[PDB]
Design a protein around this ligand. Structure first.
Ligand SMILES: CN[C@@H]1[C@@H](O)[C@@H](O[C@@H]2[C@@H](O)[C@H](O[C@H]3OC(CN)=CC[C@H]3N)[C@@H](N)C[C@H]2N)OC[C@]1(C)O
Ligand SMILES: CN[C@@H]1[C@@H](O)[C@@H](O[C@@H]2[C@@H](O)[C@H](O[C@H]3OC(CN)=CC[C@H]3N)[C@@H](N)C[C@H]2N)OC[C@]1(C)O
Ligand SMILES: [Ca+2]
Ligand SMILES: [Ca+2]
Ligand SMILES: [Ca+2]
Ligand SMILES: [Mg+2]
Lengths: 152, 150
């Protein structure tokens, strides 16, 4: 069974090729139109940051899913928060346990680092993403409203 | 008012950062709260990805907000996440929160960011009322999930 072959890996600084592969998976799975990938100098800078962690799911050397996360150091606690910003699984591999393994590995990593909490969000209209998140034993869920300002 | 000043905190502003944290504790009615040690708070203030704005009447902090820079992989232009915003209860509904948002967006515009965002709980009418008054570009209904770690 694939469970005995799937590997979850946290990307290191030499993993720009795998990071680009995951961004391409995001482009495909989120159906991003007219996307121009940032230059590799920028993506390398991001991968080098101490507050950004990428996890990928691999079968052989093929990336079948992954997630991105940001560290938010807190002023209320000495234990940080982690914000999972994106998670996606290749459409051919969905509903096979990969997303759950990615969440498990991510939360294990941040537990070992002494973080307080990990969080992730889904759009109210995204039935697929909500059903997934509700299957990962989250501590709680809350309805929230997101506001943004597009800058000039 | 013209006496109101908006200040972006710098690395020599730990005392004002602590006053803003205490304002948060009071305005959010935070429970079972013990402030981190000042070594920790100074290290956070010194981060290149964290910016605090405060509102002052003379020496008194009457509101403020905190924000995190999120460098993107979909764009070279970054995002800013406004994490907390509060105004002292005695000074609310006098334009202070709107002035803080304006100053924050102006700052991130000058630095070439793509977008600033902020969130409110769906049950929090007061915070939803305030955010909608700041003329945001759009709003979206989302579900927030958290995992409390051992
Ligand atoms: C116009 N500027 C935009 C900016 O407002 C923001 O829009 C977000 C929107 O795409 C998100 O839904 C997409 O995102 C993902 C994961 N990446 C999965 C499903 C996708 N349909 C939504 N959850 C939050 C929205 N705020 O991010 C994109 C942007 C181009 O920067
Ligand atoms: C148990 N772990 C906790 C973690 O889940 C989280 O709880 C959040 C709670 O404070 C927030 O309430 C405050 O939000 C703010 C801004 N600070 C102003 C209005 C307040 N009502 C609520 N909006 C969302 C909750 N998830 O923060 C504390 C924690 C200890 O880390
Ligand atoms: Ca393209
Ligand atoms: Ca460039
Ligand atoms: Ca100052
Ligand atoms: Mg085209």
């Amino acid at each position: 069974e694939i469970d005995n072959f799937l590997k979850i890996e946290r990307l290191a600084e030499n993993d720009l090729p795998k990071f680009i592969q995951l961004i391409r998976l995001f482009e495909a799975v989120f159906e991003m139109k007219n996307f121009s990938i940032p230059d590799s100098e920028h993506l390398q800078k991001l991968l080098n940051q101490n507050n950004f962690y990428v996890f990928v799911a691999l079968l052989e050397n093929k990336i079948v899913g992954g997630l991105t996360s940001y560290v938010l150091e807190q002023y209320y606690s000495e234990k940080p928060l982690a914000y999972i910003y994106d998670l996606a699984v290749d459409t051919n591999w969905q509903r096979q346990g990969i997303g759950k393994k990615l969440i498990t590995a991510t939360n294990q990593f941040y537990t070992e680092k002494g973080f307080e909490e990990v969080f992730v969000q889904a759009d109210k209209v995204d039935d697929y993403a909500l059903d997934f998140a509700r299957s990962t034993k989250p501590t709680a869920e809350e309805q929230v409203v997101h506001f943004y300002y597009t800058l000039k």
